[PDB]
Curated annotation (Swiss-Prot), chain B:
Mutagenesis or variant effect for L23I: In strain: Omicron/XBB.1.5, Omicron/EG.5.1
Organism encoding this protein: Severe acute respiratory syndrome coronavirus 2
Assembly information from the UniProt record: Binds to host ACE2. RBD also interacts with the N-linked glycan on 'Asn-90' of ACE2. Cleavage of S generates a polybasic C-terminal sequence on S1 that binds to host Neuropilin-1 (NRP1) and Neuropilin-2 (NRP2) receptors. Interacts with host integrin alpha-5/beta-1 (ITGA5:ITGB1) and with ACE2 in complex with integrin alpha-5/beta-1 (ITGA5:ITGB1). May interact via cytoplasmic c-terminus with M protein. May interact (via N-terminus) with host bilirubin and biliverdin, thereby preventing antibody binding to the SARS-CoV-2 spike NTD via an allosteric mechanism.
Stated role: Attaches the virion to the cell membrane by interacting with host receptor, initiating the infection. The major receptor is host ACE2. When S2/S2' has been cleaved, binding to the receptor triggers direct fusion at the cell membrane. When S2/S2' has not been cleaved, binding to the receptor results in internalization of the virus by endocytosis using host TFRC and GRM2 and leading to fusion of the virion membrane with the host endosomal membrane. Alternatively, may use NRP1/NRP2 and integrin as entry receptors.
The organism's place on the tree of life at top rank: Viruses
Protein name as catalogued: Spike protein S1
Interval of the full protein contained in this chain: 346 to 394 of 1273
Effect on the protein upon substituting R1T: In strain: Omicron/BQ.1.1, Omicron/XBB.1.5, Omicron/EG.5.1
Result, substituting S30F: In strain: Omicron/BA.1, Omicron/BA.2, Omicron/BA.2.12.1, Omicron/BA.2.75, Omicron/BA.4, Omicron/BA.5, Omicron/BQ.1.1, Omicron/XBB.1.5, Omicron/EG.5.1
Length: 49, 49
């Protein structure tokens, strides 16, 4: 198993899915078409701001 | 000034060369959905009007 982690805007969470496009999906973190994993995200406005 | 949605405006774009990358590459758009066309291939495609 590979665990990947990063911080993004709340509006960008929708780009972290297979087949997505946009600045994050196209130029930061691209998921494969047949992705087998799970995407876990939580608000961090208490730590990262 | 934009139009009221009950009286939505329409403009014909024609007899011209487009570059949809100028639009899709901009970060200001909060939503850029496409139906029956893909935002990337949209710049390789051509239309009557």
């Amino acid at each position: 198993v590979y665990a990947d982690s990063f911080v993004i805007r709340g509006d960008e969470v929708r780009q972290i899915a297979p087949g997505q496009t946009g600045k994050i999906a196209d130029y930061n973190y691209k998921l494969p078409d047949d992705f087998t994993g799970c995407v876990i995200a939580w608000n961090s406005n208490n730590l990262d701001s | 000034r934009f139009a009221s949605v009950y009286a939505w405006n329409r403009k014909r774009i024609s007899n011209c060369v487009a570059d949809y990358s100028v639009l899709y590459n901009s970060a200001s758009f909060s939503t850029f959905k496409c139906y029956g066309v893909s935002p990337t291939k949209l710049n390789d495609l051509c239309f009557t009007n």
